[PDB]
Structure 1
Amino acid sequence: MIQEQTMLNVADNSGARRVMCIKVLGGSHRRYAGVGDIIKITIKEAIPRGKVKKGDVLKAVVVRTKKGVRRPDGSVIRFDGNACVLLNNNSEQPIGTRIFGPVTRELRSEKFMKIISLAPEV
């Protein structure tokens, strides 16, 4: 259940360490976001040799949530913490060469195909 001013753990080797969800993309007066919804985020922290530096602003996709992703059978896959992959701001597609952690099944949506190919679980 991502919202404004929410810290998220980085989900890939983009070189970012800590990030925050400054804005929630996708519709007027929108509040919550998650599962796989795009969110632009500031980079509050990053390792020195990484592709990204602190204070950078670019769109990113949620991959994991503490709330978890709901399923038609009523099952839900909760995670210990939130995470997101840094998509390119210009035209999607992840920047990092490796996405850590088990991405959820809901990412299956054409554009996110590059992300799910990495990380063997789920």
Structure 2
Amino acid sequence: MIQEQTMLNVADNSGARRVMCIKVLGGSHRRYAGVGDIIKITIKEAIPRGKVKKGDVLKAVVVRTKKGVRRPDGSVIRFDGNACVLLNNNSEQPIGTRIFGPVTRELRSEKFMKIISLAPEV
């Protein structure tokens, strides 16, 4: 459950560190954002030799939420952080490679299976 100006962390080795939501994609006037959905973000903190720089704008998909996500049975999995991974601003391709921190089981969506293959756990 993410909305505007929410400060997140990047789970990949792209080069960023601190991002911030500038818009939740899909659906008109939609407020929140599910754990396996995409949002337009920006870079508020990056490493010197990163592939991207501060202030740049591009797409990214969330992975971890402090609110977490429920399961078909009723169980829920909360995290102690809000993280995401960068995507290609026009092709949805994940620019970052090495992903840290476990992800969700529901993301077996084929377009993120690439991420799940490089995902460490769950």
Alpha-carbon distance in structure 2 between the residues aligned to 1:121 and 1:6 = 25
**Residue equivalent to 1:59:** 59
Q: Is the 8 A contact 2:35 2:65 kept in 1?
A: yes
Q: CA offsets per residue over residues 84-105 of structure 1, 9 Å max, x none?
A: 0001111112101211110111
Q: Is the 8 A contact 1:93 1:114 kept in 2?
A: no
Q: CA offsets per residue over residues 52-78 of structure 1, 9 Å max, x none?
A: 100010010000101111101100010
SS of 1:93's equivalent in the other structure is coil
Following superposition, the deviation at residue 34 of structure 1 comes to 2.4
Q: Is the 8 A contact 2:100 2:120 kept in 1?
A: no
Note the 1:8-87 alignment, pairs <5 A. Answer: 8-87=8-87
**Residue equivalent to 1:106:** 106
**Residue equivalent to 1:3:** 3
- Deviating 4+ runs (over 2 angstroms): none
For these two proteins, the number of residue pairs brought into alignment is 122
Q: Is the 8 A contact 1:43 1:55 kept in 2?
A: yes
Q: CA RMSD in A?
A: 0.8
Q: Where does structure 1 lack aligned partners over 5 or more consecutive residues? A: none
Alpha-carbon distance in structure 2 between the residues aligned to 1:89 and 1:69 = 26
Q: Percent identity?
A: 100
Alpha-carbon distance in structure 2 between the residues aligned to 1:106 and 1:20 = 24
Following superposition, the deviation at residue 120 of structure 1 comes to 3.0
Q: Where does structure 2 lack aligned partners over 5 or more consecutive residues? A: none
Q: Is the 8 A contact 1:3 1:21 kept in 2?
A: yes
Following superposition, the deviation at residue 112 of structure 1 comes to 0.6
SS of 1:67's equivalent in the other structure is coil
TM-score in terms of structure 1 length: 0.97
Q: CA offsets per residue over residues 2-57 of structure 1, 9 Å max, x none?
A: 10111001110010010000101010011000211100101011001111100010
Following superposition, the deviation at residue 119 of structure 1 comes to 2.6
TM-score in terms of structure 2 length: 0.97
